[PDB]
């Protein structure tokens, strides 16, 4: 809606702060999964003998 989009600019940077917080959160789960799972440098393979 154009009218609500015009009225939403009067509130300053509420949406920008919300987007910045959610983008930091989304970067944070990538950092979480990288620091949990990617502690190994080179990927090793199991030999066929078990």
């Amino acid at each position: 809606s154009t009218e609500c989009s015009n009225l939403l600019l009067q509130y300053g940077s509420f949406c920008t702060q919300l987007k910045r917080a959610l983008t930091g959160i989304a970067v944070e789960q990538d950092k979480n999964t990288q620091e949990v799972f990617a502690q190994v440098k080179q990927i090793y393979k199991t030999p066929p003998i078990k």
Binding site: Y11, F14, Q17, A21, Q39
Partner: protein, 50 residues
């Protein structure tokens, strides 16, 4: 003026709440720094990848 007071109170409450969450993160990092000076600097940690 009540509209401006409510808006600025909401902005200050958002600022204080985000600073409280950020201060919790800084407090966790400071507890980690206290642990990493007690164990690393004031000792020798036997924990692997610590």
């Amino acid at each position: 003026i009540d509209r401006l007071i409510t808006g600025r109170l909401q902005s200050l409450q958002t600022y204080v709440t985000q600073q409280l969450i950020r201060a919790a993160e800084i407090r966790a990092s400071a507890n980690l720094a206290a642990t990493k000076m007690s164990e690393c600097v004031l000792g020798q940690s036997k924990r692997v990848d610590f």
